[PDB]
Every structure is written in C-alpha cells, then in structure tokens.
Amino acid sequence: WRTLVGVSHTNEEVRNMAEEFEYDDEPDEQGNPKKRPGKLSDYIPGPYPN
Amino acid sequence: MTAAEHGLHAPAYAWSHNGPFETFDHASIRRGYQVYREVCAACHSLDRVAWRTLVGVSHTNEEVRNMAEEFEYDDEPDEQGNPKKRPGKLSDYIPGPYPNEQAARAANQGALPPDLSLIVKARHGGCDYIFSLLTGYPDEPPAGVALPPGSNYNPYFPGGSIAMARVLFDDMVEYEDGTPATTSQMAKDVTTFLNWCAEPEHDERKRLGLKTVIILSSLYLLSIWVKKFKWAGIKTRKFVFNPPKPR
Amino acid sequence: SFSSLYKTFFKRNAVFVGTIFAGAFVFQTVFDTAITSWYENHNKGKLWKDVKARIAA
Amino acid sequence: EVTDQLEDLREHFKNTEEGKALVHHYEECAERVKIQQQQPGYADLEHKEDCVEEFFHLQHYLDTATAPRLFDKLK
Amino acid sequence: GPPSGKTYMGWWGHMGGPKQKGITSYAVSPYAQKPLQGIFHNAVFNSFRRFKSQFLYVLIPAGIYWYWWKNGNEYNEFLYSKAGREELERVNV
Amino acid sequence: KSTYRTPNFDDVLKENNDADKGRSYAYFMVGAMGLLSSAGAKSTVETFISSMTATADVLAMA
Amino acid sequence: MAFRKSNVYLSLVNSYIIDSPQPSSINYWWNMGSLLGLCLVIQIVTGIFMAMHYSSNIELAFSSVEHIMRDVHNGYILRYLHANGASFFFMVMFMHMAKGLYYGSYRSPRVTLWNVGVIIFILTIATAFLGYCCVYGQMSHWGATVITNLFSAIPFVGNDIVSWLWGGFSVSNPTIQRFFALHYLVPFIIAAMVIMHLMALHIHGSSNPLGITGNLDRIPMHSYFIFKDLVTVFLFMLILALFVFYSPNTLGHPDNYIPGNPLVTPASIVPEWYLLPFYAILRSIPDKLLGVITMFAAILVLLVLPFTDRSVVRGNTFKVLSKFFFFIFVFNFVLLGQIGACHVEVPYVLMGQIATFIYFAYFLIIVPVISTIENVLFYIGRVNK
Ligand code: HEC
Ligand code: HEM
Numbered sequence: 001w002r003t004l005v006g007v008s009h010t011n012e013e014v015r016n017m018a019e020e021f022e023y024d025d026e027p028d029e030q031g032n033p034k035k036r037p038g039k040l041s042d043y044i045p046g047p048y049p050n
Numbered sequence: 051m052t053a054a055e056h057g058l059h060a061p062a063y064a065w066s067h068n069g070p071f072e073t074f075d076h077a078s079i080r081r082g083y084q085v086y087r088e089v090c091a092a093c094h095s096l097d098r099v100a101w102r103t104l105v106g107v108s109h110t111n112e113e114v115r116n117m118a119e120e121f122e123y124d125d126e127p128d129e130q131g132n133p134k135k136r137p138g139k140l141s142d143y144i145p146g147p148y149p150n151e152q153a154a155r156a157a158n159q160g161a162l163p164p165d166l167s168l169i170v171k172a173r174h175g176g177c178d179y180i181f182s183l184l185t186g187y188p189d190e191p192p193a194g195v196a197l198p199p200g201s202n203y204n205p206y207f208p209g210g211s212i213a214m215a216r217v218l219f220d221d222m223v224e225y226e227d228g229t230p231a232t233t234s235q236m237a238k239d240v241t242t243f244l245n246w247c248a249e250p251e252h253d254e255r256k257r258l259g260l261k262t263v264i265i266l267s268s269l270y271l272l273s274i275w276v277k278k279f280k281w282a283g284i285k286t287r288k289f290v291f292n293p294p295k296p297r
Numbered sequence: 298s299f300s301s302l303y304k305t306f307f308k309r310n311a312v313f314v315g316t317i318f319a320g321a322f323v324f325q326t327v328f329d330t331a332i333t334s335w336y337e338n339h340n341k342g343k344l345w346k347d348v349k350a351r352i353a354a
Numbered sequence: 355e356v357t358d359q360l361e362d363l364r365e366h367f368k369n370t371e372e373g374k375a376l377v378h379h380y381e382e383c384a385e386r387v388k389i390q391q392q393q394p395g396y397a398d399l400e401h402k403e404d405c406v407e408e409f410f411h412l413q414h415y416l417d418t419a420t421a422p423r424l425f426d427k428l429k
Numbered sequence: 430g431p432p433s434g435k436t437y438m439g440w441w442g443h444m445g446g447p448k449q450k451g452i453t454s455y456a457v458s459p460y461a462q463k464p465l466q467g468i469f470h471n472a473v474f475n476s477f478r479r480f481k482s483q484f485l486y487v488l489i490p491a492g493i494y495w496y497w498w499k500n501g502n503e504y505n506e507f508l509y510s511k512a513g514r515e516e517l518e519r520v521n522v
Numbered sequence: 523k524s525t526y527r528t529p530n531f532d533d534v535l536k537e538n539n540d541a542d543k544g545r546s547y548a549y550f551m552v553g554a555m556g557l558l559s560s561a562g563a564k565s566t567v568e569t570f571i572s573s574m575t576a577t578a579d580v581l582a583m584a
Numbered sequence: 585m586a587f588r589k590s591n592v593y594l595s596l597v598n599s600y601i602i603d604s605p606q607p608s609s610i611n612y613w614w615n616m617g618s619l620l621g622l623c624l625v626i627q628i629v630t631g632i633f634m635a636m637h638y639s640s641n642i643e644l645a646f647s648s649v650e651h652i653m654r655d656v657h658n659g660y661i662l663r664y665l666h667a668n669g670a671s672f673f674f675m676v677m678f679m680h681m682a683k684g685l686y687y688g689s690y691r692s693p694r695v696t697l698w699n700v701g702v703i704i705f706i707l708t709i710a711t712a713f714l715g716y717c718c719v720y721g722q723m724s725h726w727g728a729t730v731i732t733n734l735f736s737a738i739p740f741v742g743n744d745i746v747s748w749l750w751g752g753f754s755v756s757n758p759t760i761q762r763f764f765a766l767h768y769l770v771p772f773i774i775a776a777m778v779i780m781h782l783m784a785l786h787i788h789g790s791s792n793p794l795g796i797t798g799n800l801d802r803i804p805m806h807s808y809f810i811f812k813d814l815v816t817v818f819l820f821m822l823i824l825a826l827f828v829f830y831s832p833n834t835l836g837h838p839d840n841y842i843p844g845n846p847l848v849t850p851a852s853i854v855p856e857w858y859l860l861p862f863y864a865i866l867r868s869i870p871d872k873l874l875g876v877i878t879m880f881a882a883i884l885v886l887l888v889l890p891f892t893d894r895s896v897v898r899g900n901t902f903k904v905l906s907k908f909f910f911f912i913f914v915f916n917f918v919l920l921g922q923i924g925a926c927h928v929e930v931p932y933v934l935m936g937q938i939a940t941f942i943y944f945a946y947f948l949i950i951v952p953v954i955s956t957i958e959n960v961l962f963y964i965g966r967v968n969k
C-alpha cells in the first residue's frame with residue numbers, strides 16, 4: 001500500500017483503502033487468532049485464499 | 051555472581067553413553083519416549099524430530115506409523131479451497147501441544163516452555179543438568195528464599211526459581227517392558243531420550259571416530275618414520291674444516 | 298627371496314601403485330567390517346537389534 | 355514396591371558423618387532465619403538472610419556422594 | 430623479465446652467502462642407515478636436557494599468572510558468598 | 523686431518539647392507555602410508571559427494 | 585631445462601614448493617604456515633558444501649543449520665569440521681604469530697611480510713565473527729548486537745554506520761543476509777592475501793631459529809620439508825578428528841543451540857574463545873569509543889614491532905630476558921582470554937585492566953628496554969677493558 005503514496009493517491013487516501021481491508025494480526029494473550037485493519041506496510045490482498 | 055545465581059553445578063553421573071566407544075541404551079530411548087508422550091508432551095514441543103527418525107532407534111516402522119496416524123496435520127486444500135486435515139505419515143514432524151507462543155504463555159503462568167529438541171546441547175552440563183533438574187526438586191525451599199507465586203524451587207536452575215512444577219512422581223508411567231518406573235528411573239530415560247533428540251548421529255559419529263582415529267594414528271606414525279628415513283642423510287651429516295692456505 | 302620380492306612389487310612404479318590401490322580396496326572392506334563388528338559387540342544389549350529381540354521375546 | 359533409588363541414596367548419605375554435620379549447619383541456619391522472620395518490621399529490612407548457602411553445601415555433598423552409585427541401581 | 434630489488438637470498442648456485450673453502454660435507458645414504466636410531470636414548474636423555482635447559486622461562490611466568498588467576502578466582506568466590514557481603518558492598522560501592 | 527679420511531658413521535650404518543632388503547623395508551613403509559592415505563582420501567571424497575547427494579527430508583517424500 | 589622449470593605454472597609451483605630453498609635448521613614451528621594453508625582449504629571446502637544447504641533468512645538460519653546437522657548425509661561432519669576447524673585455524677594462527685614474535689621474523693627484511701600477516705589476522709578475525717553470526721543462535725545475535733553496537737560510539741556518524749551495518753534498526757534478516765554474503769566473500773580475499781604473504785616470504789626466504797644467515801646451508805623444500813610438513817599435517821588431522829568426532833561441542837558455547845531471540849538476554853554475552861582476549865581488551869576500558877579504539881590498537885600494535893625491537897641479534901633464542909618476557913606475554917594473553925570469558929565483577933575488572941596494560945607494555949615498553957639492556961650486556965660480557 002505504501003508504494004501508491006505519491007503516485008496515484010495521497011497518504012490519507014491510501015490509508016482508507018488499507019483500513020477497508022483486513023489482515024491477520026499477532027494472536028492475543030490467550031493464543032486465539034485475531035484480525036487487524038490493514039495499514040500502509042501491508043500488501044494489496046487477493047480475492048481468493050488459495 | 052552468587053552461587054544461587056549460577057545455580058548448583060550438576061554432578062557427573064555415569065551415563066551409558068559417556069565414553070569413546072559407547073552407544074545410547076536404545077531401550078532407554080524407548081522408555082524415554084514413553085515418558086515424553088505421557089508426561090512431557092503436555093507442555094513441551096519437539097518441533098525438530100521427525101517421526102521417521104524414531105524408526106530403527108526406539109520403535110519399528112509399523113510402530114511409528116500408528117503414532118503418526120494418531121496425530122493430525124494440515125493437508126493441501128480440497129477442490130473447493132476449504133482447509134483440510136490429514137492423518138500423519140512418517141515424513142511429518144512430532145507436533146507440539148500449543149499452537150503458538152501466546153497459547154503456551156497463557157497455559158503456563160506466562161513462562162514459555164522451551165522446545166526440548168536441542169536442550170541437552172543447549173544447556174551447560176547436558177544430561178547431568180537435565181537429570182539433576184528433573185529430580186532435584188526439594189519438597190521445601192531453604193528457609194529465607196523469597197519465592198514468587200507460581201514458581202517452584204530447584205537449585206539447579208540458574209536463579210533457583212523455576213516455573214516448571216515437579217512432574218515426575220513414582221509409578222506415574224507403566225513401562226512396557228516392566229521396568230520399575232521410579233522418578234529417577236523415568237528421569238534417566240527421558241534424559242537419554244532428549245540426548246538422542248539432540249544428537250541422533252551419536253552412535254555413527256563415535257563409530258566413524260574410531261575408524262578415523264585408528265587410520266590417522268597409523269598415518270601419523272608412518273609419516274614420522276618416513277620423515278626420519280627421508281631426513282637421515284641430512285641428519286647424519288658431518289662437516290670438517292681444514293682451514294685454507296693464505297694467498 | 299628379497300630380490301624376487303623387490304623385482305616383483307617395488308621395481309615398477311605402476312605395479313607399486315596398483316598394489317597400493319588393491320590393498321586399499323581390501324583394507325577398506327575388511328577394516329570397516331572389523332570396526333563395525335567390534336563396535337556392535339562392545340555395545341551388546343544397547344543396540345536396536347537387541348532391544349528388538351527383547352521386544353520379540 | 356520399588357521406591358525411588360535416588361531418595362534412598364540421599365537418606366543414606368544424610369545419615370553419615372559428613373551429612374549429619376551439614377544438615378546440622380542447615381537446620382541451625384533455618385532456625386536462625388525463622389527467628390528473624392518472627393521479628394517485627396521484617397518485610398522492611400531489605401537484607402534478609404537465606405539458607406541457600408547451607409542447602410547448597412549439603413546438596414553438593416549429596417551430589418558428589420550419590421553421583422557414581424545411582425546409575426548402577428537404575429535399570 | 431624485469432629485475433626485482435636487491436634481496437638477501439639468491440637461488441641454487443648464487444645464494445648470496447660468503448665464499449666457502451675448506452668446509453667439507455660427508456653424508457651417507459639413508460638406504461644404508463638406520464632410521465629410528467637413537468630414538469630411545471634421545472627420548473629419555475636428550476629430551477630431559479632440552480626440558481631442563483628450557484623450563485624455567487616457561488614455568489615461572491605460567492606459575493605467576495596461574496597463581497594470580499587462582500587468587501583472583503578465590504577472592505571473587507569469597508566476595509559473592511554469604512561470608513563476604515560486607516566487603517562486597519564496600520568494594521562495589 | 524685429511525679429506526680422504528671419512529668420519530665415523532659406524533653408529534648409524536646398519537650392519538648388513540643388502541640392497542633389496544633395505545629397499546623393500548623402505549618402500550613397504552612408504553607404500554603403507556600411501557595405502558592408508560588412499561583409504562582416507564577415498565573416504566573424504568565420498569563424504570563430500572554423499573553430502574551433496576540427497577537428504578532424508580526429500581527421501582521421505584520420495 | 586626441466587619441465588617443472590620451463591613451464592609457466594609449474595615454475596611457480598616449483599619455486600614455491602618443490603625447489604624452494606629452505607634452511608636446514610628450521611624446526612616444527614615452521615610447519616604452522618603449511619598447517620594454516622591446510623586449515624584454510626578445509627574451511628573453504630566444508631563451507632561451500634554447507635552453503636549448498638544453508639538458508640540465510642532470519643527465520644531459516646538456525647533451522648537450516650539444524651537441517652545440516654540432521655538431514656544432510658555426513659552433515660554433522662561438515663558442521664563440526666567447520667566449527668572445530670575454525671577454532672584450530674585460530675590455534676595454529678596464534679602459534680604462527682607467536683613464532684614470528686619469538687624468533688623475530690618481523691624484523692628488517694620481513695617487515696612487509698609481517699604487515700601482510702597482520703592484515704590476514706584482521707580478515708580472519710572478521711570472517712570468524714561473520715560466520716559465527718551466520719548460525720543465528722543465542723550467542724550469534726547478542727555477539728552481533730554488542731560488536732555492531734560498538735560502532736555507535738563514533739561521535740559524528742556512529743548511528744549511521746550502525747544502521748548501515750545492521751541494514752535496519754537491530755540485528756535482523758538484513759544483517760544476517762549481509763553476514764552470510766560477506767562470510768562467503770571474505771575467505772577469497774584471505775586467499776589472495778595468503779598469496780601476497782607467500783610473495784613477500786619468497787623474496788627473502790624463511791628465517792631459522794638461530795637468527796643467523798641461512799644462506800650457507802640450505803635444503804630444497806621437496807622431499808625434506810614436504811614430509812616434515814606431512815608429519816604435522818597428519819598430527820593436526822588426528823587432533824582435529826578427535827575434537828570433531830569424540831568431543832565436538834567442547835570449544836563452542838552451549839547457548840548457541842537456543843534459537844535466536846532478540847527479547848531474551850542470555851546473561852553472559854560471550855564471543856568465541858579466540859575473540860575473548862580482544863573482548864577483554866575492549867571491556868577493560870570504561871568507555872565505548874576508547875574501548876573499540878583500544879581493541880583495534882591491540883590488533884594493530886603488531887606493526888610497532890619491527891621499530892621497537894632495538895636488539896641487534898634476531899630472535900630470543902639466545903636472550904634470557906627476552907625469553908622470560910615473551911612467555912610473560914604469552915601467559916598474559918591466556919589470562920586475558922580467561923578474564924574475557926568471565927563476568928564484569930570486582931577482581932576481574934582490575935585483573936583485565938592490568939593485563940591489558942601488560943599486553944600493551946610488552947610491545948612499547950618492555951621490548952625496547954630489554955633489548956637495549958641485552959645489547960649492552962652482550963657487548964660488555966666479551967669486551968675486555
Ligand atoms: C507442564 C505445564 C509442564 C510439564 C508436564 C513439563 N514441563 Fe518442563 N517446563 C515448563 C515450563 C513452564 C518451563 C519454563 C521454566 C522457566 O523458564 O521458568 C519448563 C522448563 C523446562 C526446561 C528448561 C530448564 C532451564 O531452562 O534451565 C527443561 C529442560 C524442561 N522443562 C524439561 C521437561 C521434561 C524433560 C519434562 C517431562 C518428562 C517436562 N519438562 C515436563 C512446563 C512443563
Ligand atoms: C576463512 C575461513 C573460514 C572461517 C574462519 C570460517 C569460520 C566460521 C565459523 C566460526 C562459523 C560458525 C561455526 C558454528 O559455530 O556453527 C562458520 C559458519 C559458517 N561458515 Fe564459515 N568460515 C570460513 C570459510 C567459509 C566459507 C568460504 C564459507 C562459504 C562458502 C563458509 C560457510 C559457512 C556457513 C554456511 C556457516 C553456517 C553455520 C554452520 O553450518 O556452521 N565458511 N564459519
């Protein structure tokens with residue numbers, strides 16, 4: 001997501017799309033899986049899991 | 051540092067594999083796997099040991115296939131892309147009890163149980179330290195030890211305060227060959243098993259060491275003889291000096 | 298018959314190095330067998346064949 | 355009926371000439387430390403005596419004693 | 430090729446040593462000799478001569494540093510014990 | 523002292539100086555060193571090649 | 585002329601190995617250089633055959649070394665050969681430098697040979713450090729963290745040099761991949777410097793234990809020193825085979841089989857044993873900048889040696905005080921390594937400081953004074969007046 005900043009969108013414009021997608025987080029204190037709203041370091045996600 | 055902060059140095063027990071021509075007691079590896087599967091595998095992982103390496107050391111091929119089938123692993127996803135499980139084969143690895151570190155720290159008072167694949171080589175003392183840590187749990191800590199809640203006392207752990215409770219008690223494991231499972235017998239067996247999991251090349255390495263040491267000692271003595279033979283003509287030189295006439 | 302011994306084995310260097318390699322082949326086989334037998338005999342009862350025979354009986 | 359062989363060895367070497375002296379030193383320390391714990395203001399002393407040293411002397415003697423003899427008994 | 434600088438070693442024939450007259454070398458064939466001659470005499474006698482001439486230079490400084498290290502190790506083990514905590518906090522603070 | 527008076531090598535000369543005997547003795551030792559060097563060189567080269575051959579991790583997936 | 589003489593490449597091989605005039609009186613301390621060449625060949629071959637299987641990511645480094653120990657056929661042979669052969673590389677190299685220090689092989693003709701050897705010593709120290717960090721155990725991470733956090737003491741550009749070495753903000757996957765790439769690259773620079781070492785040795789020939797000129801009685805290197813080197817080569821293989829097959833993890837620290845964890849400090853961050861004297865020279869100075877300056881000056885104090893040796897004869901073979909103070913220096917180096925293995929506690933701080941002062945006073949203070957005293961005593965012992 002961070003490569004689009006300064007090419008086709010701005011910083012606060014890319015952040016909204018990255019927040020619209022959801023990725024995997026580090027698991028919580030009980031070791032359960034956890035999802036996280038995405039950020040600029042994450043990658044553009046594909047439509048299919050595999 | 052203090053002696054409590056170093057820990058008590060573990061003494062030198064006479065293992066069946068100490069010594070330059072010795073081998074692992076493989077029945078002790080079998081009994082150590084029994085005490086691992088029945089006691090240690092509740093909290094400790096074995097993420098580096100495949101099932102296939104157990105074959106021909108402690109169990110047979112059909113004997114390891116049943117344990118590998120008793121566990122379950124992640125398969126390639128099916129035609130619809132759903133996640134799928136699979137009964138294991140020989141080529142898989144021994145699975146740990148917890149899916150991640152945070153689950154382990156949730157289950158063990160915040161202290162992560164280490165993976166026992168290399169822990170004989172990973173600690174100073176080795177098998178002596180593992181045996182002395184497993185058996186050397188005093189029923190009472192010495193008077194004056196401020197012990198935290200949830201931390202047991204063990205003088206061999208560096209610092210004294212270990213977060214593994216004493217897990218080896220008498221006759222908790224019914225051995226297959228009718229060996230009388232005391233706590234020290236079970237500790238000897240798991241320590242031999244964890245030393246096998248650390249160094250599974252141990253028997254072949256000492257075998258090749260005997261071959262190599264014999265060949266290189268013979269080559270060293272032959273090379274000494276060949277050196278003295280080639281150098282004898284120079285070594286037994288004699289110089290005489292009759293001083294020349296002045297010009 | 299040291300003259301015959303020298304003239305056969307040590308006069309020609311080709312026959313010399315050929316005897317060296319032939320002896321090295323025989324030595325590798327026999328010596329590896331001897332170390333394997335001595336190691337497995339010193340460690341009797343501790344190897345997997347002995348543990349397997351104990352399980353079988 | 356087979357009880358723990360290491361505990362039997364540790365009892366046998368606690369009931370010896372050196373071992374009774376070393377448990378006398380450790381029990382004397384434990385008495386002194388429980389007397390110090392009975393005193394008021396003990397939690398605000400910031401230097402509290404512990405008998406890890408006497409327990410380490412006793413346990414090191416028992417380790418040097420029972421180290422060579424145990425693995426004979428262990429099948 | 431190009432010449433290099435003035436060196437203190439030539440080759441076989443022009444070594445760079447002085448002229449020699451009168452020094453005569455004698456050397457018999459090793460195939461007529463006994464290798465391993467004198468190894469038992471020189472194993473116990475010549476070896477004792479070499480060791481006797483050259484062991485004070487190696488054994489006085491080794492003893493000096495080993496005694497220094499042993500003394501420092503014993504002082505450290507006394508300091509981080511229970512009997513020497515007063516001296517520990519004194520020399521630490 | 524003349525140069526034609528060769529010195530005393532008598533303590534290092536062997537008493538019998540048969541040629542085939544002494545040469546068989548010298549070349550048997552040189553040949554034994556070459557023997558064990560050939561065995562060790564074979565074992566070393568086969569060690570490195572057998573390290574390059576395959577692994578158990580893929581021989582299980584064979 | 586002979587074909588080994590008239591050929592292009594066989595003339596090099598002939599004048600360096602076959603026909604090379606060695607002195608008659610050199611002893612088995614002159615076998616250490618050939619042993620270092622054998623050590624370097626062993627390290628390069630075993631390291632290539634393990635780089636065929638090693639994976640230099642931070643998630644795959646320790647597990648790939650564990651794969652070499654477990655899945656690669658004779659892979660424990662390669663791994664223990666590499667680790668124990670690096671330890672023996674430094675054992676034989678310390679013997680080589682100490683031979684040059686005793687017999688005075690640094691002096692007036694061989695000063696460039698001494699400086700090229702010092703360059704090889706720097707490069708071998710660096711190669712051992714990078715390859716130790718390649719394992720990514722617990723000692724690799726924290727040793728890399730300490731010795732690359734040393735460079736944050738430089739006042740102007742310290743953090744820039746540190747974050748350029750790390751490739752990030754701590755020891756991580758960039759740093760481990762730099763360290764594997766450079767640990768592959770550097771031994772070929774060492775092999776080039778070994779060839780230059782051989783050039784500088786070849787222009788003037790070896791010294792002998794007497795120190796007097798070897799130009800009179802000389803012996804070809806083939807068939808005499810080939811077998812005199814073969815004896816020690818087989819002895820070196822014997823001791824290395826013992827240390828590889830029977831006691832393979834003696835010289836290593838046992839903390840390295842813990843996976844590399846940046847959030848857990850292993851309570852004694854200690855490098856390999858052949859870096860412990862320079863680590864004690866580091867820790868003796870209570871400053872971060874002056875400590876790394878003192879460690880680099882400890883390595884580069886070998887270059888003051890041909891200028892401070894005021895002796896007129898070469899080598900301590902016939903010098904009582906130079907013998908005694910050379911062995912005070914050698915066991916001071918041993919005591920300094922034994923200090924560096926230990927914790928930063930009360931007698932060890934002053935012991936390492938006094939031993940660092942002895943380590944520097946040998947090259948700058950002891951050797952000129954003792955050698956001038958020996959010149960004057962050698963004169964007045966046989967001049968009658
Ligand atoms: C249940 C919970 C268990 C069981 C059944 C076992 N262990 Fe142990 N273990 C546990 C924890 C929480 C810890 C961490 C302790 C701490 O760091 O405070 C451990 C630790 C070990 C260690 C490491 C000791 C050290 O770091 O010095 C070893 C070697 C160990 N555990 C071995 C072991 C064996 C051999 C067991 C059964 C046969 C075993 N553990 C059971 C938690 C638990
Ligand atoms: C100058 C000679 C060399 C020295 C001194 C040296 C030193 C070291 C050391 C000390 C280690 C750590 C060993 C351990 O504790 O596991 C190591 C590891 C390693 N070295 Fe080298 N090395 C040398 C040459 C090479 C070369 C040229 C390569 C690459 C081809 C190489 C590849 C490796 C690899 C892959 C490791 C990974 C960890 C292991 O398996 O040991 N080495 N090196």
Ligand code: HEM
Nearest residue numbers: 614616617618620621681684689701702704705778790791
């Ligand atoms: C990879 C490391 C090295 C290799 C392969 C190497 C190789 C050699 C060889 C083969 C010799 C000739 C044989 C001998 O005299 O011992 C030699 C001589 C020498 N080397 Fe090294 N060397 C290395 C490292 C060093 C180091 C670290 C120093 C010290 C700074 C050094 C200094 C010398 C000196 C002074 C000589 C000449 C000794 C003499 O003959 O009088 N070398 N080297």
